[PDB]
Structure formats: C-alpha cells, structure tokens
A and B are shown apart, each in its own frame.
Chain A
Amino acid sequence: NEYDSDITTWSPTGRLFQIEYANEAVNNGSATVGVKGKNFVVLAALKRSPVAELSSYQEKVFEIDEHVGMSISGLVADGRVLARYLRTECMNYRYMYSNGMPMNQMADMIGEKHQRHIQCSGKRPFGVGLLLAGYDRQGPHLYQTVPSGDVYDYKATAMGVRSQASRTYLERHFEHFSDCTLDELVTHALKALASATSEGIELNVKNTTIAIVGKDTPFTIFEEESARKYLDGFKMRP
C-alpha cells in the first residue's frame, strides 16, 4: 500500500487514505454522548478514571460562548486549536452584531476550517471530532464534526471508543426526546454513556462531565461538585 503516503493522493478507488486514518483517531478517543431535547441540549462525556488514589483530569468539554459549547474526542492537541478559533469567531461575531452567532452559521464555519486542511501538501487533517451544543432563536442544535470536514445536524449521537453500544441504546429512545424534560434528558444521556464503558466500571462523579445548554440556561459544565444531582442516584438497570 503506497497510496497513503500523502493527504494529496487518490487511490485507484477514489479514496483518501490519510482521512480514513484520521477517522481512526476519533474512533479511539474517550466516549461522549449528546442528546438534544425540545428546549435543552445535554452533553455527557466520560473522562479518565482515578487510579485508586490519584486523579488525572483533562479538559474535554469547552464553552465557546454563552449559548454554545463543544465536547471533543480524539487528539486534544487539535481540539484546542479548534476551540481557540471558534471562540475567536464567536467573539468577532458578537462584537459586530451584538448577538450570539447562530448554530447553522457556526457549523459551516467549522466545516470550512476543516476542509481547508485536507487539500494542500504541507497540512494534515484534524484528528479530532466535535460535539457542538447550542441554542439560538430557532432552538437547540446538536452537531457532530468529523476529520473529513463533514457536519451532521443530529437529534442524538455518540462517538468515541465502543460508542456503537451507546448508539444502539440511543436508537430506541430517540423518538421521545422532544417530550422528556431536563432530568429525563440527562438520565437518558447518562444511561447511553454508561453503556460504552468497560465491563466492571460504572458511572460516578469521578469520571463524568455533564454540560447543559438551553433556552433560559447559559452553557453550564457540571463536574464532581454538582454532578451528584444527576449522578449520585444512577443505576444501569438492564
């Protein structure tokens, strides 16, 4: 196989192998699950567990503005490159029009920023996938970006290592999300997330982040302190 040496080489079957490799970087990151309701969006990310006494803590969830937010998966050293740009652009927009940038415009910005990096020789595709969570005049939006540059407006999604089981759970309850309320949304999201962890590991405040953004609710991250309202009572009931 000599047709993956560069990002600017087409295989005889019209494939870009560097991008098909970059997708494997997302398929091996920490699992995250996003669930979009009628008035709220809930992201639930599974961080790294403490080794019996010691707590390694890495920022996967980011706030981009009062109404936006994003959970990355894959190489974080690219997620920060994109979060700096998204923050800069939502600020350049709130400075001109003095209002929050609409999601349908920010998703396209992310798409173009990705695509600009998959067409030249001295570049490489971002090996990081995003879960955008926003709210504007038109209501809650949940996107998902891939390394190839696509953007998908989702109703409920999950990505990361062994996220196929999270999707297999979500593809049974995703028809009733427009009616379940906030607590029910965060419970659906946590139940879907805990379905991607290892065998003998369960969800608890130590290894879970819960971000929420809705109509009257700015983007709030939830770590150990107040995650207990949604996390301390939680059982993976089969």
Chain B
Amino acid sequence: ASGGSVIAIKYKGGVLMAADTLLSYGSLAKWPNIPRIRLLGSHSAVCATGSYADFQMMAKQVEDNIERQKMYHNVDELSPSEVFSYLHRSIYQKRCDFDPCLCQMVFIGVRDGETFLAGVDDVGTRWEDDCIATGYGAYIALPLLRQALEKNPDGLSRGEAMRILTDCLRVLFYRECRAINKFQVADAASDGVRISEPFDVETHWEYEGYCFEKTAII
C-alpha cells in the first residue's frame, strides 16, 4: 500500500495541509475511504507519502513518545519543532540500519503563535518553508503555491489560501494517475489542529478542443 501526494501552506495565522484519502497497491486504487492525516499530541499533525506500513509504524512510535512523556512526568507537552526533531532523528537512525522508513512526511503544527511547517524525506533530509509538497505535488502543485506566495508576500488570508489549495488539488487530480477526487484539509490554528470532512473539488472536461473529431488521428 502507498499514499498519494501531500501539499501544505502557511497562511496568516495557521497552516493548511491537504491530502487525498486513498491507498493504492501499485496501479490499483485499493482503499478510497481511509484517513491519511494523523495528528500527534494537541498541537501538531503529520501526513506521509509512499508506503503506508512505514508511516503507520513511525507515527505510532512518535505518538507513544509524546503521551508517555507528558503522562509520566509533570512536564509540558512537546512543541511542534521538537516532536518533528525526534521524528527526523528516528528516520535517520532507521536509515543507517539499512531499514529505511520509505515515506516522505509533511509535518504541521501551531503552538501559541509560533507556527511551524516542515518536511522530511526518508533518507534523512529535512527542510522547512512556507509551502511543502511531497509525492508528485512537489512538481505539479509546488510551483503554484510558490507563485501564490510571492504574488503577495505579506501573508495570505485563510480563504485566500484555501482557494489556491483547491486550485492546486484540482490540477493534482487532473495530472496524477494514482489519485481520486476526494480530499481532506487539516487546518492548524492557535486552538489546535482540526481535520475537515472529505470534500470534492469541481472539475472541467468540456473544452472544445477535446471533441471527437478534433482529437482524431485518422
């Protein structure tokens, strides 16, 4: 099994991470109604591309660590950046054992103002931006997010960023083979991460240039 693509963007006050709700087995769309967005602790969320077993094990291993640490000792729960750091160190440690965690993850989180959005590969590479995307979203979706960021660097609004998230999800549906039209958007604001109900983006297949006579190679 293997997930699809993930995209994520920071707006004025929070983060948005969108992902399709589908698990494929090679070319076969196996399960179209499973949730791929997990959320860790009470401030952060994660979503992985590629093999599902590895993401399922790694997210479980980093969700056991958060709750135990907070329950055993009287300490504050880990900030987004620190649970992401632990995620990255564990992925790198699994890679040194030739036991790779073959999934590119996108990690979002918000804690009282300091909003955090990072991404980690499976070889151990980690980065942070104002827009992340894995799978094929790094090629198709990411350029659109980058232009929508730079056309107004002051900071997008929540609706003005949800718009472009829909506009990139549409193209990802058009141009990615192993994808379906039923996505989910996890929105992380100061209160905390909140996953939305599945929704569908509308499409357009009625260009005149697609008519039977024109596309014909007689």
Contacts and interface: CB of A to CB of B under 8 A. Distances in A.
Interface of A: 95-99, 102, 104-105, 108, 137-138
A105 B89 CA distance: 20
A210 to B, nearest CB: 29
Contacts of A99: 79, 81-82, 85
Nearest to A153: B74
Contacts of B78: 97
Contacts of A108: 72-73
Contacts of B85: 96-99
A108 B89 CA distance: 24
B89 A138 contact: no
Contacts, number: 30
B89 A104 contact: no
Secondary structure call for the A interface: loop
24 contacts: A95-B89, A96-B85, A96-B89, A97-B78, A97-B82, A97-B86, A98-B81, A98-B82, A99-B79, A99-B81, A99-B82, A99-B85, A102-B73, A102-B75, A102-B76, A104-B73, A105-B69, A105-B73, A105-B75, A108-B72, A108-B73, A137-B76, A138-B75, A138-B76
A138 B72 CA distance: 17
Contacts of B75: 102, 104-105, 138
A137 B69 CA distance: 15
A88 to B, nearest CB: 16
Interface of B: 69, 72-76, 78-79, 81-83, 85-86, 89
A21 B83 CA distance: 44
A148 B89 CA distance: 36
Nearest to A105: B73
A98 B82 CA distance: 6
Given A96-B89, A105-B69, 5 more contacts: A102-B73, A104-B73, A108-B72, A137-B76, A138-B76
B19 to A, nearest CB: 26
A98 B118 CA distance: 15
Most chain A CB within a 10 A radius of its CB, from B72, B74, B83:
B74
Contacts of A96: 85-86, 89
A12 B3 CA distance: 66
A82 to B, nearest CB: 19
* Of A97, A108, A137, A138, most B-chain CB atoms within 10 Å: A97
Contacts of A105: 69, 73, 75
Nearest to B90: A96
6 closest A-B pairs by beta carbon, nearest first, are: A97-B82, A98-B85, A102-B75, A105-B73, A104-B74, A104-B73
B196 to A, nearest CB: 30
A96 B82 CA distance: 8
B167 to A, nearest CB: 36
B183 to A, nearest CB: 32
B88 to A, nearest CB: 9
Nearest to B93: A96
A89 to B, nearest CB: 14
Nearest to B69: A105
Contacts of A98: 81-82, 85
Nearest to B83: A97
A98 B85 CA distance: 7
Contacts of B82: 97-99
A204 to B, nearest CB: 41
A137 B77 CA distance: 11
B48 to A, nearest CB: 20
A178 B69 CA distance: 29
Nearest to A138: B76
A236 B141 CA distance: 73
B69 to A, nearest CB: 8
A99 B85 CA distance: 10
Nearest to A99: B82
A15 to B, nearest CB: 30
A94 B86 CA distance: 10
Contacts of B86: 96-97
A198 to B, nearest CB: 41
